[PDB]
Amino acid sequence: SNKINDALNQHYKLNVELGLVYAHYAHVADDEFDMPYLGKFIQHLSEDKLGVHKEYISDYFKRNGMKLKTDVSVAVKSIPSDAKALIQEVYARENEVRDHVKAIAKLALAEDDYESFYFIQWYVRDGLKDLTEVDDVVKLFNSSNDKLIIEETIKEMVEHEIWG
Amino acid sequence: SNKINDALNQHYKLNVELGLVYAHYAHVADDEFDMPYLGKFIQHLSEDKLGVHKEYISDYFKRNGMKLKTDVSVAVKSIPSDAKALIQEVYARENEVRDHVKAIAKLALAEDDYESFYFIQWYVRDGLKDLTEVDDVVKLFNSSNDKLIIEETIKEMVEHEIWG
Amino acid sequence: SNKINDALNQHYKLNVELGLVYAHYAHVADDEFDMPYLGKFIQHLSEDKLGVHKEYISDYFKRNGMKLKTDVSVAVKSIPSDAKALIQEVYARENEVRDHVKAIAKLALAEDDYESFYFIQWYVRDGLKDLTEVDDVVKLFNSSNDKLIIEETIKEMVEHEIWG
Amino acid sequence: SNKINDALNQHYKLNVELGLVYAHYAHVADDEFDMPYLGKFIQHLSEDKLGVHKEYISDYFKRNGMKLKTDVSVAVKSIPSDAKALIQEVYARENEVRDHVKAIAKLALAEDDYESFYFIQWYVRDGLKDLTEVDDVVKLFNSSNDKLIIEETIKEMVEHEIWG
Amino acid sequence: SNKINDALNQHYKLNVELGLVYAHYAHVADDEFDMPYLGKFIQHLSEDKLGVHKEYISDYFKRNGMKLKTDVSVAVKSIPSDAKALIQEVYARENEVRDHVKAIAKLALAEDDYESFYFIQWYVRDGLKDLTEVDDVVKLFNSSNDKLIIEETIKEMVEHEIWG
Amino acid sequence: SNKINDALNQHYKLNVELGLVYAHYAHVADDEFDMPYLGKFIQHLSEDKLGVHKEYISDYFKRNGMKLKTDVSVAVKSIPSDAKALIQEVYARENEVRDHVKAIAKLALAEDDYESFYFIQWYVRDGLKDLTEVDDVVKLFNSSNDKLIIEETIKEMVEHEIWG
Ligand SMILES: [Fe+3]
Ligand SMILES: [Fe+3]
Ligand SMILES: [Fe+3]
Ligand SMILES: [Fe+3]
Ligand SMILES: [Fe+3]
Ligand SMILES: [Fe+3]
């Protein structure tokens, strides 16, 4: 089936682009907003987005017999004003990748291709896991106004059976 | 100094592009040329190119006070015919990054910016180290004709005080 | 060469004077500004400035055959108003010692005296390391207004491969 | 009481000056008189003179409520002829610091300031301890004429309940 | 570049010749001057001169792509009169190899060949290290006149972070 | 006896020359014939030829009362075409040193100098041991034609009561 091929290629592309964008956001949050631990958090997100999230697609392509296509285009020319807008933008990106994964899963189940469904279950779980991990931090900036308190909270954060 | 800034930005861009290209080459060498261990070798190269090689530039920029710029554009539309041409192309890329690093070091020393010189010494070493690691394998395909012998050699390979 | 001798003697003198000044600043920050941990931080700076930073110059003089000269004159008759101005003054002193080291390195390389260059590389690294360590704390007083939060941050602070 | 303040400030100044002078003497004894172990001995003396001997005064000032004053002036323009005159000069400096401490203790007891007396007991002990440690070595150069025998003796030296 | 090739070939030749000469001097100091430990010292020097000091040049030639040339010519027909002249001659040889290394480093930096500079830094350090190790012993024969005292000193000698 | 002196001096000279020649052959076999393990083998041979094989003669000369003479002259201006001719030349050198040792032993026994006979027994054993070790490898190139198989054999080789 070529529809699953196209959808998984789109997901590969999206994952690479998000990895690079998150890396840049982590750097700019460390260098300008004077919050190194928000930088470490977004850097861990970027590493997970550039590692297993695309290595698994490459491996599945090796295993079932599809063709891979590399095509990336990223140019970060705009950044938000403070840490709150930055973390809300990261949250929106996660909320979008959730819907993309849902669309791929529906397409796979409508093709009678149950190996691809069993494959995409991992993503329909990890999407919610990571969105929750990011929402836990976007909730912080609604709770206090001293930067160092939020810093220590995120520090102790970085220091389940269904989802986790 | 802005010249060092421009040169290091160019190096950042080059490193990201090479990382992606090497990842694709590793996959296509595993999937088509029936050599998984050449795939593992090129994958380790891609990981080193996408990790520390750009994280160190990001950290140095954080530390001295320069501005980072993300701009990538990669589209792999051509691949070689057999493993020998693939490994020779990888070798050529390494031979090019060597010259790029040499130019950066000359520019840094001609600016009276000795912190950047002390910083780029690491790269003028790692360039030769990695070029040697790749030449060791491009020498293999001039020595035998059975694929599995080369496979076992690379397997035992993956299994100094100045350079290393 | 006598020019390198004069430059290294000037550096010896500067290091001794900075050691004493930092010791006094640590005491006055402990006794008046009610911040003992800022005192401990500046005391560790003073110890590093009065120890190895001049012992290494004495050793190099013993080793290559130059003459040492002791001449100190310090009189701290003015102190800043609050901890922020104190830490900014410490930062300025670090930013000055950086330029002094850069000048010595240029002079050494222009003399064809490569042993002195290999010797001063240690200083062109440690300058950036220590300036970063002090900037990390001068960033704190732009982030909060409760003294004890900054205290706990510095406490957990006191509790790399290129630079560090 | 301000008299104790003045006396302890004088002792602080004297200790810093002696520290620097002893450091220079250690270097010149290592570099010219071809005796590295006499250098190590005088260096340990200089470290003890520049460390606890003034840190304790700084701490006591923090604790009782007096003001500290930093004012140093050292210029070593003359050095003795051989190791014997050097060690005799060090001995004379110790014999002088003994009398200075005795004067401070008398002044403290004549003021009805018994905390300062309890504080200065440590110094009236350490003075005799260190003078004895130096006399043990100035006795050596009255016993032999081979430099290396004295060297081995001092080496094994560097390798009580009332005083010690 | 062929100039660096010629210079490194000259250094290879010089190192082999010095190795052989030092071996002969060690033997003759053991057999005639009745000092076995001076023999052991000079033998360790000869081993370091014949081992890594030329193996590293061979390895660098393998690594960058230059050609090696073996041409040796040694004939020890004259020896000094006592141990003092012997150790002073060894010292002079070290003082000469220092200048040879300095010339090679200048030539490398004037060619814009920074890999050779990074390579020769090791030698510009080891030269000073070894010259200091030999001067420590040539200082002994200015301190005493009993042979066995010097023997025990050298015995305990044979029994840093920048240089060492 | 001076005849034994002359013969042992000749053996000393021969051993030094063979050491240097073998070192060069090891390098050229690593750099040109693309066989690093043959290089390691010949390097171990060169180390044994330059170490104990001449240190024992130096020690025996110290012990019985003869005079040592250093005179070397080597110029490697010709090398064979492939690894087989190289290893056959090494074998011929071993076959020659065997006969030289036999001649020395006959001369010693014909002089009624039984200490020299007891001394040379070690060499009349080690000659056969080393010739066998080299013949084991010159037999390999008569058994296969893939370079990497021979490589793995020599690798596992490098990884008795009369002779050994
Ligand atoms: Fe994830
Ligand atoms: Fe690398
Ligand atoms: Fe420091
Ligand atoms: Fe003391
Ligand atoms: Fe050495
Ligand atoms: Fe042998």
CSV table of C-alpha atoms in Angstrom, one decimal, chain F:
chain,number,residue,atom,x,y,z
F,1,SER,CA,90.4,-13.2,24.7
F,2,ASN,CA,89.9,-10.7,22.0
F,3,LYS,CA,88.4,-12.9,19.3
F,4,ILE,CA,85.2,-13.4,21.3
F,5,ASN,CA,85.3,-9.6,21.8
F,6,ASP,CA,85.4,-9.0,18.1
F,7,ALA,CA,82.7,-11.5,17.3
F,8,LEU,CA,80.3,-10.2,20.0
F,9,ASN,CA,80.9,-6.6,18.7
F,10,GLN,CA,79.9,-7.8,15.2
F,11,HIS,CA,76.8,-9.3,16.6
F,12,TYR,CA,75.9,-6.1,18.4
F,13,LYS,CA,76.3,-4.1,15.2
F,14,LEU,CA,74.2,-6.6,13.2
F,15,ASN,CA,71.4,-6.6,15.8
F,16,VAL,CA,71.1,-2.8,15.7
F,17,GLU,CA,71.0,-2.7,11.9
F,18,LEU,CA,68.4,-5.4,11.7
F,19,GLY,CA,66.3,-3.6,14.3
F,20,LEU,CA,66.2,-0.4,12.2
F,21,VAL,CA,65.5,-2.3,8.9
F,22,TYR,CA,62.7,-4.3,10.4
F,23,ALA,CA,61.1,-1.1,11.8
F,24,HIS,CA,61.1,0.5,8.4
F,25,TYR,CA,59.6,-2.7,6.8
F,26,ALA,CA,56.8,-2.8,9.4
F,27,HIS,CA,55.9,0.8,8.5
F,28,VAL,CA,56.0,0.3,4.8
F,29,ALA,CA,53.9,-2.9,5.1
F,30,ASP,CA,51.3,-1.0,7.1
F,31,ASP,CA,51.2,2.0,4.8
F,32,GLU,CA,51.3,0.5,1.3
F,33,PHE,CA,50.3,-3.2,1.4
F,34,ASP,CA,47.2,-2.4,3.4
F,35,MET,CA,48.0,-5.1,6.0
F,36,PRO,CA,48.3,-3.5,9.5
F,37,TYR,CA,48.7,-6.9,11.3
F,38,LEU,CA,51.8,-7.9,9.3
F,39,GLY,CA,53.0,-4.5,10.4
F,40,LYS,CA,52.4,-5.3,14.0
F,41,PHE,CA,54.2,-8.6,13.6
F,42,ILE,CA,57.3,-7.1,12.1
F,43,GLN,CA,57.2,-4.3,14.7
F,44,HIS,CA,57.3,-6.9,17.5
F,45,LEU,CA,60.3,-8.5,15.8
F,46,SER,CA,62.0,-5.1,15.5
F,47,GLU,CA,61.4,-4.5,19.2
F,48,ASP,CA,62.9,-7.8,20.3
F,49,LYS,CA,65.9,-7.2,18.0
F,50,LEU,CA,66.5,-3.7,19.4
F,51,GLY,CA,65.9,-4.6,23.1
F,52,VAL,CA,67.1,-7.7,25.0
F,53,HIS,CA,69.2,-9.0,22.1
F,54,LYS,CA,71.7,-6.2,22.6
F,55,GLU,CA,71.1,-5.4,26.2
F,56,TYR,CA,72.3,-8.9,27.1
F,57,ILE,CA,75.6,-8.3,25.2
F,58,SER,CA,76.0,-5.0,26.9
F,59,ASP,CA,75.5,-6.6,30.3
F,60,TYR,CA,77.9,-9.5,29.7
F,61,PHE,CA,80.5,-7.0,28.6
F,62,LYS,CA,80.0,-5.1,31.8
F,63,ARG,CA,80.3,-8.4,33.7
F,64,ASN,CA,83.4,-10.0,32.3
F,65,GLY,CA,85.5,-6.9,31.4
F,66,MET,CA,85.4,-6.3,27.6
F,67,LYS,CA,85.1,-3.0,25.7
F,68,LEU,CA,82.0,-2.0,23.7
F,69,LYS,CA,82.0,-0.3,20.3
F,70,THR,CA,79.1,1.5,18.6
F,71,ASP,CA,79.2,1.9,14.8
F,72,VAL,CA,76.0,1.8,12.7
F,73,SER,CA,75.3,2.6,9.1
F,74,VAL,CA,71.9,1.8,7.5
F,75,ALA,CA,70.3,3.2,4.4
F,76,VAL,CA,67.1,1.5,3.2
F,77,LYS,CA,66.9,2.5,-0.4
F,78,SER,CA,65.0,-0.6,-1.8
F,79,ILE,CA,61.8,-2.4,-0.8
F,80,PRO,CA,60.1,-5.5,-2.3
F,81,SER,CA,56.9,-5.5,-4.4
F,82,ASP,CA,54.3,-7.3,-2.3
F,83,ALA,CA,53.9,-8.8,1.2
F,84,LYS,CA,55.2,-12.2,0.1
F,85,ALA,CA,58.6,-10.9,-1.0
F,86,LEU,CA,58.8,-8.8,2.1
F,87,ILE,CA,58.2,-11.7,4.5
F,88,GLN,CA,60.6,-13.9,2.5
F,89,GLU,CA,63.3,-11.3,2.9
F,90,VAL,CA,62.7,-11.2,6.6
F,91,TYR,CA,63.0,-15.0,6.7
F,92,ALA,CA,66.3,-14.8,4.9
F,93,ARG,CA,67.7,-12.4,7.4
F,94,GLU,CA,66.7,-14.8,10.2
F,95,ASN,CA,68.4,-17.7,8.4
F,96,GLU,CA,71.6,-15.6,8.2
F,97,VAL,CA,71.6,-14.6,11.9
F,98,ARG,CA,71.4,-18.3,12.7
F,99,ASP,CA,74.6,-19.1,10.9
F,100,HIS,CA,76.3,-16.1,12.5
F,101,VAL,CA,75.4,-17.3,16.0
F,102,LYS,CA,76.7,-20.8,15.1
F,103,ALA,CA,80.0,-19.4,14.0
F,104,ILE,CA,80.4,-17.5,17.3
F,105,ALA,CA,79.6,-20.6,19.4
F,106,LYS,CA,82.2,-22.7,17.5
F,107,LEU,CA,84.8,-20.0,18.1
F,108,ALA,CA,83.9,-19.8,21.8
F,109,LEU,CA,84.2,-23.5,22.3
F,110,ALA,CA,87.5,-23.6,20.4
F,111,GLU,CA,89.1,-21.0,22.7
F,112,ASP,CA,88.4,-22.9,26.0
F,113,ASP,CA,86.1,-20.1,27.1
F,114,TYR,CA,83.2,-21.9,28.6
F,115,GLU,CA,81.5,-18.8,30.1
F,116,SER,CA,81.0,-17.5,26.6
F,117,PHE,CA,79.6,-20.8,25.5
F,118,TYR,CA,77.1,-20.8,28.4
F,119,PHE,CA,76.2,-17.3,27.4
F,120,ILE,CA,75.7,-18.0,23.7
F,121,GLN,CA,73.4,-21.0,24.3
F,122,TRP,CA,70.6,-18.6,24.8
F,123,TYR,CA,71.1,-17.2,21.3
F,124,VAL,CA,71.5,-20.7,19.7
F,125,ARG,CA,68.0,-21.3,21.1
F,126,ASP,CA,66.3,-18.0,20.3
F,127,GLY,CA,67.5,-18.1,16.7
F,128,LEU,CA,65.5,-21.3,16.0
F,129,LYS,CA,62.5,-20.0,18.0
F,130,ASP,CA,62.3,-16.8,16.0
F,131,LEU,CA,63.0,-18.4,12.6
F,132,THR,CA,60.1,-20.8,13.4
F,133,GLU,CA,57.8,-17.9,14.3
F,134,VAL,CA,58.5,-16.2,11.0
F,135,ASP,CA,58.2,-19.4,8.9
F,136,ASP,CA,54.8,-19.9,10.4
F,137,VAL,CA,53.7,-16.7,8.6
F,138,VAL,CA,55.6,-17.2,5.4
F,139,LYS,CA,53.7,-20.5,5.1
F,140,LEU,CA,50.3,-18.6,5.1
F,141,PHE,CA,50.8,-16.9,1.7
F,142,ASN,CA,51.0,-20.3,0.1
F,143,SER,CA,47.6,-21.3,1.4
F,144,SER,CA,45.1,-18.6,0.4
F,145,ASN,CA,44.6,-15.5,-1.8
F,146,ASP,CA,42.1,-13.4,0.2
F,147,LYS,CA,44.1,-10.7,2.2
F,148,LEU,CA,41.6,-10.5,5.0
F,149,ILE,CA,41.7,-14.3,5.8
F,150,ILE,CA,45.5,-14.0,6.3
F,151,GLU,CA,44.8,-10.9,8.4
F,152,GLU,CA,42.5,-12.7,10.7
F,153,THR,CA,44.9,-15.6,11.0
F,154,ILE,CA,47.8,-13.3,12.0
F,155,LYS,CA,45.5,-11.4,14.4
F,156,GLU,CA,44.6,-14.6,16.2
F,157,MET,CA,48.3,-15.5,16.2
F,158,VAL,CA,49.3,-12.3,17.9
F,159,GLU,CA,46.3,-12.4,20.2
F,160,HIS,CA,57.5,-24.9,24.7
F,161,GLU,CA,59.9,-26.4,27.3
F,162,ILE,CA,63.1,-26.7,25.1
F,163,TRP,CA,62.7,-24.0,22.5
F,164,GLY,CA,60.0,-21.7,23.7
